[PDB]
Scaffold this active site. Sequence first.
Site, PDB file in Angstrom:
ATOM      1  N   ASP A  85     -29.872  79.027  31.195  1.00 54.16           N
ATOM      2  CA  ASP A  85     -29.245  78.703  32.624  1.00 54.16           C
ATOM      3  C   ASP A  85     -28.591  80.279  32.851  1.00 54.16           C
ATOM      4  OD1 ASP A  85     -27.673  77.804  34.237  1.00 54.16           O
ATOM      5  OD2 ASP A  85     -25.925  77.704  32.534  1.00 54.16           O
ATOM      6  N   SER A 103     -21.687  79.711  30.939  1.00 58.12           N
ATOM      7  CA  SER A 103     -22.673  78.387  31.158  1.00 58.12           C
ATOM      8  C   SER A 103     -21.836  76.860  31.302  1.00 58.12           C
ATOM      9  CB  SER A 103     -23.879  78.328  30.269  1.00 58.12           C
ATOM     10  OG  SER A 103     -24.756  76.941  30.352  1.00 58.12           O
ATOM     11  N   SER A 120     -18.763  78.797  36.170  1.00 55.23           N
ATOM     12  CA  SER A 120     -20.151  78.466  35.877  1.00 55.23           C
ATOM     13  C   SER A 120     -20.174  79.359  36.351  1.00 55.23           C
ATOM     14  CB  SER A 120     -20.812  76.799  36.391  1.00 55.23           C
ATOM     15  OG  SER A 120     -20.149  76.443  35.596  1.00 55.23           O
ATOM     16  N   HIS A 133     -28.063  77.063  36.267  1.00 52.38           N
ATOM     17  CA  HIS A 133     -27.601  75.556  36.967  1.00 52.38           C
ATOM     18  C   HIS A 133     -26.916  75.289  38.424  1.00 52.38           C
ATOM     19  CE1 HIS A 133     -23.599  75.637  35.259  1.00 52.38           C
ATOM     20  NE2 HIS A 133     -23.192  75.297  36.055  1.00 52.38           N
ATOM     21  N   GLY A 143     -16.196  75.331  37.500  1.00 58.11           N
ATOM     22  CA  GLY A 143     -15.971  76.205  38.792  1.00 58.11           C
ATOM     23  C   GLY A 143     -16.323  77.455  38.536  1.00 58.11           C
TER      24      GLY A 143
END
Lengths: 198, 4
Positions: free
Chosen positions: A63, A159, A143, A36, A141
Amino acid sequence: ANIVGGIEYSINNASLCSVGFSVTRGATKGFVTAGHCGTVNATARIGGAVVGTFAARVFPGNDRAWVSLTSAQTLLPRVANGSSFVTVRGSTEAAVGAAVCRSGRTTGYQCGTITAKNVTANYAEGAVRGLTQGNACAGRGDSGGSWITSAGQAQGVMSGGNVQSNGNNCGIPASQRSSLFERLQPILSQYGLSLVTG
Amino acid sequence: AAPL
């Protein structure tokens, strides 16, 4: 730029995510991160300089993504922990109950334990299945950032999570946190990548 | 839970 797990990078001069792990694909340098965070061919910058572009991703469903870097980048077997570093030794998957830490540009380095595997997160975009849950906290942030054991075994990339209105789940007790990461091993085999270790 |  030196590519270390946990550090900030931008996507097309707008979003921010964190580097997961330095990897190679034959002679190509790259890093694994969350799907993502960008779309294929999105430009990744570290500290204002172009370091490479998204080569592939799957999101939602899974993801995961990997960024192919230019040859000028320096891949390192390390994950940021404050001013210090954790050495990446391999990718043995830890079991439930195991202690785990994660690194990312918003909350830094947080540790907790693995509480569940094969969790489905129902994001606005669609479900992402097969995630592992820990109770280390995380924030917007983080991720794409690294989940690693202190012994240096790389677990996966950040994720999502049950973030509160302050942008993280660090102010609710560990018992109430759901911070989910995508397992690293399927990403390595899906893209034919090898982990850089030290 | 949200992405991130």
